[PDB]
Design an enzyme around this catalytic site. Structure first.
Site, mmCIF file in Angstrom:
data_model
loop_
_atom_site.group_PDB
_atom_site.id
_atom_site.type_symbol
_atom_site.label_atom_id
_atom_site.label_comp_id
_atom_site.label_asym_id
_atom_site.label_seq_id
_atom_site.Cartn_x
_atom_site.Cartn_y
_atom_site.Cartn_z
ATOM 1 N N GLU A 97 0.826 -1.213 0.000
ATOM 2 C CA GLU A 97 0.000 0.000 0.000
ATOM 3 C C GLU A 97 0.855 1.257 0.000
ATOM 4 O OE1 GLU A 97 -2.732 -1.111 -0.654
ATOM 5 O OE2 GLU A 97 -3.621 -2.508 0.763
ATOM 6 N N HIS A 122 1.871 0.915 -4.164
ATOM 7 C CA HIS A 122 0.626 1.504 -4.662
ATOM 8 C C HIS A 122 0.621 3.022 -4.602
ATOM 9 C CE1 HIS A 122 -1.770 -2.493 -3.901
ATOM 10 N NE2 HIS A 122 -0.750 -2.644 -4.728
ATOM 11 N N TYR A 129 0.285 5.563 -7.917
ATOM 12 C CA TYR A 129 -0.776 6.555 -8.130
ATOM 13 C C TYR A 129 -0.177 7.947 -8.355
ATOM 14 C CZ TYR A 129 -4.703 3.429 -6.854
ATOM 15 O OH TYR A 129 -5.648 2.427 -6.863
ATOM 16 N N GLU A 148 -5.136 -5.776 -4.484
ATOM 17 C CA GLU A 148 -6.301 -5.530 -3.606
ATOM 18 C C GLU A 148 -7.226 -6.749 -3.536
ATOM 19 O OE1 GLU A 148 -4.924 -3.200 -2.397
ATOM 20 O OE2 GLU A 148 -4.984 -1.284 -3.414
HETATM 21 MN MN LIG Z 1 -3.422 -0.379 -2.371
HETATM 22 MN MN LIG Z 2 -4.965 -3.328 -0.321
#
Ligand SMILES: [Mn+2]
Ligand SMILES: [Mn+2]
Ligand SMILES: Nc1ncnc2c1ncn2[C@@H]1O[C@H](COP(=O)(O)OP(=O)(O)OP(=O)(O)O)[C@@H](O)[C@H]1O
Ligand SMILES: Nc1ncnc2c1ncn2[C@@H]1O[C@H](COP(=O)(O)OP(=O)(O)OP(=O)(O)O)[C@@H](O)[C@H]1O
Ligand SMILES: Cc1cn([C@H]2C[C@H](O)[C@@H](COP(=O)(O)OP(=O)(O)OP(=O)(O)O)O2)c(=O)[nH]c1=O
Ligand SMILES: [Mg+2]
Ligand SMILES: [Mg+2]
Ligand SMILES: [Mn+2]
Ligand SMILES: [Mn+2]
Lengths: 289, 683, 289, 683
Positions: free
Chosen positions: C82, C86, C90, C183
């Protein structure tokens, strides 16, 4: 000025124990004395315990209290390495070299060993004493973490390095060197965060924080001496390991911005040798020539 | 490391800033002094050798029995009188590792180059000692090279079929699908590459016996064919190779293409099944005008009109299909589909592109059928009629399944001997003999079309080698002028030989009277346009050889009108994968990919410079990736205007260029009259 | 029964943002209308904001309260993905497609947006309500986590998948597909941990936890419908997005061992294109009767 | 939620500590007064209904044209005069969801239970009004149930085939393999489960015409068949189901088994093709003695002896195979192979186990061929001759591929009506009619075997239901005594009907003269042993019915010797999966899996209690998993001694027991004469 470069270094160092085949150590392991195998198992078990708590507790709790998404990303990555990579690698080593009963026995031995319990009690106690928005409790836990990363692991690291340097147990040794490479950067990073907090204090407060750090180091050191003797006397190496842990204690202090505390000594040279394609849309002019 | 391998790797070691190309020659000597002669079985006389090879089931008795032993010995002596020497180590290595006959234990060499050439010549001549000697002189001069199946298997008892390109039409039925799977397995067992047309198969979600949403589409058939080709893999020697062709207006075209995506699941992706897409001019017009296109359900079209979607001209049928409520269709964006094709070709080199109207506007046998699909190498373009394989104890309606006969002219050797006519005619005769001696008992439509059409493919190779050794850039207008003249002469002499064979045997190919050869339309551009070289350098290259003029083409047209033509198809340019090594030639008419290619055999490294490569012609041996693909398209179109079938045309792209560049190359190929595009090899 | 298997699947899915070159997206981005660019930006910011909560709170809080060393390691690995992977991914997509000032404005807008805030704060509220040694409060938070991982992200994922299935914004679409794949496994794993707690409960307590889960799903679903119309009406896609939300709600319920709530529906084909018994040896005399 | 759904769920809501079974009845009423009667399509009279069903391509007009409309009206009136009521909601639900005829859009119900029964009876009678009424009375009383294909498809225009299972012999050739794939796709298209014997195919690493280590073995053919069954999946309605059978002495037997391992790679794993293993007594003997066994290469044995390995007796030829140097073999541990079988059955329920010697020691048609494999449900055990499918344009040698028609007696209804004889004879006539009107135009061996063997399968259902509703424990010796007597009666009357049909038609099945029926050996145990009940309770159960004695069996033996038998095979006990719901019967002769089964349909859940379950017979309805598998084996062997074909014997295992327990159960089944073992279902 530093988090981004630590982020890049940490992620580029990513590894898994399964990358290293361990069946090559089978013979050099078989050839060690019972005393040597016992010390080796116990040493790695002590390391496993430290990484278990560093991954479960230490790194996540420090991540929680440190501000900034990038700083948190580095600390989260380091936490993952502790329990998902480091702690697990030891089980890969155990499962290769040892029968299940010996593995079961060594994990029972960590639970009842008084020096290992004391060091865990002390380090984890400081982690769990961190109070939200209280930078002093956070500093104390970061000192504890640096001492775990840069000092406490080293009574354990000595033995795999000692063998690696003699051309023995070299696959296990390769894993350990990767773990050590990680802990060195973890200790530096946490050290820099600790220095940030220390540098905010009055001179009077700084003097107290140095007292805390030195008192804690001495308390951990005295316990580590007893642990070292307990493990290494049966293989004749206790005095050598003691020199190594003092060497690394100085590195931990330096990671915290403090002067070395122990005098320099000659370390065993064996241990030193142990160290898709791009897509464009079609224009109406591409259909005519 | 063997001595010849060290001498070969010494090429890369630069002396005075130059590659030691001549060292390669020394390697060949070593490869013959240390290995080939030591492991070559020798006999006291040729009679003993022939007896041993026949008795031990190496050769066939039938083709050798047509000659007296004196004639066979004379043919072998003619082969050995050339004293042929392989100029590069890789030529001899490839021949003695791939084509030379070895014992059952694969440790001794029974056939030399001269022995194999003599055997192939004796097989070709079918009892004529003088014709056999002519074939021996043709192949030992390396002017003509029979394809890998013919060259490897001619005269051998333990052999596959001499044809390895097979095109199958699959009708829209379970019986026809099962028969197609069976025929694909049987032809892969024979060692041939099988291409199947899946456009007649109804799309996914169509009705079976008036129950809706029942058909699995062409993707299930592709899975079945992929399993069949994996199973039939030449008795566990080579990976089973198959191709599937689908019209771009078939509704499954996306799912078809989705079989080659890396992200495709295991129940979607086919790994050993090549895919090709047939693109009519209507799709290109729709993409050009950005109008949204329609992909049609083939079974609804068949029910409405009584004919398959791929059996009628989509240019005149597309509007009627769209306006017909009883024809089911799905909206697509043709430009998005073109971008998907370019992206897939960038990722994996698939699909092959067939420009249907480019093929069929010059197709001579449109009366028999329009060319609906190509082969596994995307160079065979022939009329095919689908077969109606009915139930058991019921007579099947056998159609025409394409199977052409491969053979390549060595342009350098042919032109340096000033023997375009003789080489083309002898190659045509050999291809006719191999087509006549081919009898496949498990592919009824393939056998029927081989008997009827008598189609052969006469290719060319060493085009870039010849141009580079003559100081001509492959992209230069002089190179295209030479290709135009050379391939016009090849077409002229191929047509002349076909008409001569038709006159001698008194028979033409089936349904020749409806062909453009019979009506004289084929010769139109030949009786009005002069194809003599426009550059003095090319004319000097053609010195000593008669270049057919418009009057010669008129005479040939009259001769074809009077006598007919024996072959429905004569010329197709195959990739020529491994035979180009043995002939010391560049592959096909393609430009070279690398000047010196590095290969790994066993645990050893080997280095093959392109034939005739030196310091003087290093610049003229430009790599294909460095070349402008538009000029390569221009050269391939220049050649294609004289080739009745297609040319295996591989695109050579850099990693920098995007899918827009690939689409631009494809659209320029379509504009320039390119019939097929084979591969998109990215460097 | 499952943690080591999920450990394996998680670590073998490891990836880094740098692996996908993003610049080639500008070749299709420039051809989108203002409404398409606006929706994409808003969706992207929505995903970014929700995923940050999961990295800073959701995964670390669950790792803290779950017992078991191996589970804590897997959860740490997920938290790392995360925060380290991730979140950077983003950010990279944003920096490629919009100038700095546009990014700041979109985040200001989405930060004030009523429907994004409603769901973000509902989830965060349940994470903040976990109490030490209370497995009921932990379960409720796990339900919230599964709903985020397996359901709430999908009103957002729809759009990048929609473009990806059309050949547009392929580089960022590849990144989104990798994120989504992470996810999915996060949702399944946390779901199994929730079922473990659920199965330890009485029948009355189970019925009460089911009512909690369905009630929470209903609240989130009704807000998702509003969120969906707010973003997708301007590009005409809301009907199809709603089908995708319900389909993913059913997956989230199945992850929690519950029955599907919504009837089965087909999904937009463009988005679809984007998307041991104990061995005992025979002892003889087993052949005689 | 529907009202009937709530009423059915009210069963589990206990009242005074007892299940509300009667609520189930209420549910059916609701299911009819709220759904079935509203969704049914009513006509003014039967004439309009029949005309609408005929012109709208719902019914075949040929079978209805054999009767005047008065006769059809009389048959329908006979069907409706019984006033049949479904006693459970699930019976009516299963009929009206799986077997009742619906409209094209499936929005309304065109067929009631009486309508379906009348149509099936009219199809069975073939123009005989009295026979049609007899069939109507037999089916409306639920004494006999035609199989799901026959019951669902009889008299329908859009029907498939009435035959449930097909068994194919695959010869060791590419032509035969391709033909087997084609026939498998054709028969799966027809809706039938296809079983293929792969024991004749040569193993992996065998020679295809003198090139060694070339064959892919049975695993490649398995992958081909798996893809074929995936493609032919009943137009996407029911997943294509296939079975592969391999002899345990085949060299590929491990790889075969490795197709079902949960850790198998995708290139080996097969997921839609069931696997069965044929175990001769030699393998069990070798495992018992712990002597290392040898698996064999079929092609070497065929080359040496001229016959296939599974074509001859391994019990007498195994030592010759081992001592023959020209036969290739591999060493295996038979006990390790047995443990692998047990582990595989524990993990996935595969393979099916066929004890070849148990099948062939009582097989009546060993002269035609030995039984070498079974069907997809492992209950069909018939002689099969492999076919020689040759090249195209060559005549094929058509063998015998097994195919039989299924039909089950409802034991409770048959014994309640005291009509074993009448029900057995009428069921035999119906199965004979189904065989006679079956003509498959794409499976030649299946067609020839259907025409020659005339084999039928007459099964039985509701054994456990009858035993539990009569206060008899399924594991008790009284239950085995009842099964012995009842199935001896069934065999007696089936043989009598077969001989009567042979007499009335003047023809027997092909090669009947060499069978044990013709020689009188088959009747040996029936002319020396009395099978009358040994317990007074069972004898009272059989009161009002003439139990055949040794004298009746002697008379039947003389009658068969004089007239012959029309059917090579008559009795086979199929699993009877979903049609047992409609008949309110327990599945087959197997014990019930659960007393009340919870099944999820749509978004609702339903509970089906076992037929006749109540407080007084709760413990007589003992669940199969709680039962001793040895006593279930004893029951199945007792039934099997009177069944000429096999019985689908599913093993019901607990999770606590080990693979050693499964192996012990398998070995006890082999010891007790069990022919086949279907499934190892673990609770
Ligand atoms: Mn994530
Ligand atoms: Mn996640
Ligand atoms: N480059 C080559 N290509 C093919 N064969 C070769 C080559 N070099 C050597 N050989 C083989 O090895 C033999 C020895 O050739 P070498 O160069 O020693 O002299 P030579 O005068 O050709 O010999 P010979 O008496 O064999 O004709 C040749 O006859 C031929 O069979
Ligand atoms: N269990 C059932 N099985 C089959 N059909 C049923 C069942 N229950 C109701 N029906 C159908 O629904 C109709 C409803 O009638 P119901 O059974 O309530 O009694 P009725 O109106 O007195 O007449 P009858 O019982 O004589 O048909 C029945 O006539 C029958 O056609
Ligand atoms: C052609 C082929 C056959 N086989 C195996 C499967 C068949 O059971 C077996 C027999 O093939 P056949 O069709 O009988 O081959 P053949 O008749 O030419 O060879 P032979 O004279 O020895 O019979 O070979 C493969 O495994 N892969 C293949 O590609
Ligand atoms: Mg048809
Ligand atoms: Mg054969
Ligand atoms: Mn660590
Ligand atoms: Mn660390």
């Amino acid at each position: 000025d530093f988090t981004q470069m630590f982020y890049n270094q940490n992620v580029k160092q990513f590894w898994l124990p399964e990358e290293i085949a361990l069946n090559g150590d089978l013979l050099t392991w078989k050839y060690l004395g019972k005393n040597e195998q016992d010390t080796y198992m116990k040493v790695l078990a002590g390391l496993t315990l430290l990484d278990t708590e560093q991954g479960n507790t230490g790194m996540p709790i420090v991540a929680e209290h440190v501000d900034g998404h990038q700083r948190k990303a580095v600390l989260n990555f380091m936490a993952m390495m502790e329990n998902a990579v480091h702690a697990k690698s030891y089980s890969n080593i155990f499962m290769t070299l040892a029968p299940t009963e010996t593995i079961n026995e060594v994990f029972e031995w960590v639970k009842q060993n008084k020096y290992l319990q004391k060091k865990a009690q002390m380090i984890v106690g400081l982690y769990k004493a961190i109070q939200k928005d209280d930078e002093i409790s956070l500093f104390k836990a970061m000192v504890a973490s640096v001492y775990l990363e840069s000092f406490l692991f080293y009574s354990g690291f000595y033995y795999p390095l000692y063998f690696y340097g003699q051309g023995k147990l070299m696959q296990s040794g390769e894993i350990i060197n990767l773990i050590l490479r990680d802990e060195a950067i973890h200790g530096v990073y946490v050290g820099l965060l600790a220095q940030e907090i220390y540098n905010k204090q009055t001179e009077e407060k700084k003097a107290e924080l140095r007292e805390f750090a030195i008192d804690l180091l001495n308390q951990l050191y005295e316990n580590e001496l007893e642990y070292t003797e307990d493990l290494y006397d049966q293989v004749g190496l206790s005095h050598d390991v003691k020199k190594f842990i003092r060497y690394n204690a100085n590195k931990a202090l330096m990671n915290l911005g403090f002067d070395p505390y122990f005098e320099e000594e000659d370390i065993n040279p064996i241990v030193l040798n142990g160290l898709k394609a791009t897509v464009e849309p079609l224009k109406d002019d591409d259909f005519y020539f | 490391v063997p001595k010849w391998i060290q001498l070969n790797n010494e090429i890369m070691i630069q002396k005075d800033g130059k590659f030691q190309f001549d060292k390669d020659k020394e390697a060949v000597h070593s490869y013959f002094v240390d290995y080939i002669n030591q492991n070559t079985v020798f006999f006291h006389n040729l009679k003993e050798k022939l007896d041993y090879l026949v008795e031990n089931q190496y050769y066939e008795e039938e083709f050798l029995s047509l000659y007296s032993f004196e004639d066979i010995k004379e043919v072998f002596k003619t082969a050995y009188a050339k004293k042929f020497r392989f100029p590069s180590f890789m030529s001899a290595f490839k021949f003695y590792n791939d084509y030379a006959l070895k014992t059952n234990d694969k440790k001794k060499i029974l056939e030399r180059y001269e022995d194999r050439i003599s055997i192939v010549a004796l097989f070709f001549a079918n009892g004529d000692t003088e014709k056999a000697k002519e074939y021996v002189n043709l192949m030992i001069n390396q002017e003509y090279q029979p394809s890998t199946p013919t060259f490897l298997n001619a005269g051998r008892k333990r052999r596959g079929e001499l044809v390895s390109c097979f095109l199958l039409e699959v009708n829209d039925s379970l019986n026809d699908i099962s028969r197609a799977i069976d025929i694909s397995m049987q032809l892969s067992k024979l060692g041939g590459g099988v291409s199947l047309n899946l456009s007649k198969l109804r799309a996914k979600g169509e009705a079976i016996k008036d129950v809706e949403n029942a058909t699995k589409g062409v993707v299930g058939v592709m899975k079945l064919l992929d399993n069949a080709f994996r199973y039939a893999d030449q008795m566990g020697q080579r990976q089973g190779s198959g191709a599937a062709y689908l019209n771009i207006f078939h509704r499954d075209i996306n799912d078809f293409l989705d079989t080659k995506k890396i992200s495709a699941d295991e129940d979607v992706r086919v790994k050993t099944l090549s895919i090709g897409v047939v693109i009519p001019d209507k799709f290109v017009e729709l993409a050009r005008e950005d109008k949204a296109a329609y992909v049609f359900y083939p079974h609804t079209i068949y029910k409405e009109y009584g004919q398959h979607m791929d059996e009628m001209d989509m240019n005149e049928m597309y509007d009627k299909f769209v306006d017909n409520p009883r024809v089911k269709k799905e909206k697509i964006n043709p430009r998005k589909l073109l971008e998907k094709l370019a992206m897939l070709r960038s990722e994996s080199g698939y699909p092959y592109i067939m420009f249907q109207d480019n093929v069929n506007k010059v197709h001579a046998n449109n009366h028999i059928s329009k060319v609906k699909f190509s082969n596994l190498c995307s160079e065979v373009l022939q009329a095919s009629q689908v077969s109606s394989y009915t139930d058991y104890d019921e007579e099947d309606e056998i159609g025409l399944d394409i199977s052409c006969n491969l053979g390549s002219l060595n342009i350098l050797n042919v032109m340096e001997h000033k023997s375009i006519e003789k080489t083309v005619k002898l190659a045509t005769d050999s291809l006719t003999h191999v087509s006549e001696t081919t009898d496949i008992r498990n592919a009824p439509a393939v056998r029927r079309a081989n008997k009827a059409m008598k189609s052969i493919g006469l290719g060319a190779m060493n085009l870039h080698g010849y141009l580079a050794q003559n100081g001509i850039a492959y992209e230069s207008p002089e190179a295209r002028d030479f290709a135009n003249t050379f391939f016009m002469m090849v077409n002229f002499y191929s047509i002349q030989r076909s008409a001569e064979i038709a006159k001698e045997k008194g028979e033409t190919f089936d349904q020749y009277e409806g062909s453009t050869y019979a009506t004289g339309e084929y010769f139109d551009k030949y009786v009005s346009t002069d194809f003599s070289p426009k550059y003095e350098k090319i004319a000097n290259l053609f010195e000593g050889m008669h270049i057919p003029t418009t009057e010669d083409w008129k005479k040939l047209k009259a001769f074809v009108a009077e006598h007919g033509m024996y072959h429905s198809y004569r010329l197709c340019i195959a990739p020529t994968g491994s035979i180009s090594y043995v002939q010391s030639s560049t592959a096909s008419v393609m430009p070279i990919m690398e000047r010196i290619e590095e290969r790994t055999y066993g645990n050893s490294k080997t280095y093959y410079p392109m034939p005739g490569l030196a310091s003087n012609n290093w610049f003229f041996y430009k790599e294909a990736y460095d070349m402008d693909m538009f000029k390569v398209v221009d050269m391939i179109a220049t050649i294609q205007q004289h080739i009745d079938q297609g040319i295996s045309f591989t695109l050579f792209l850099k990693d920098t260029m995007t899918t827009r560049d690939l689409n631009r190359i494809d659209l320029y190929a379509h504009h320039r009259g390119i019939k097929t595009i084979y591969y998109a090899r990215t460097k």
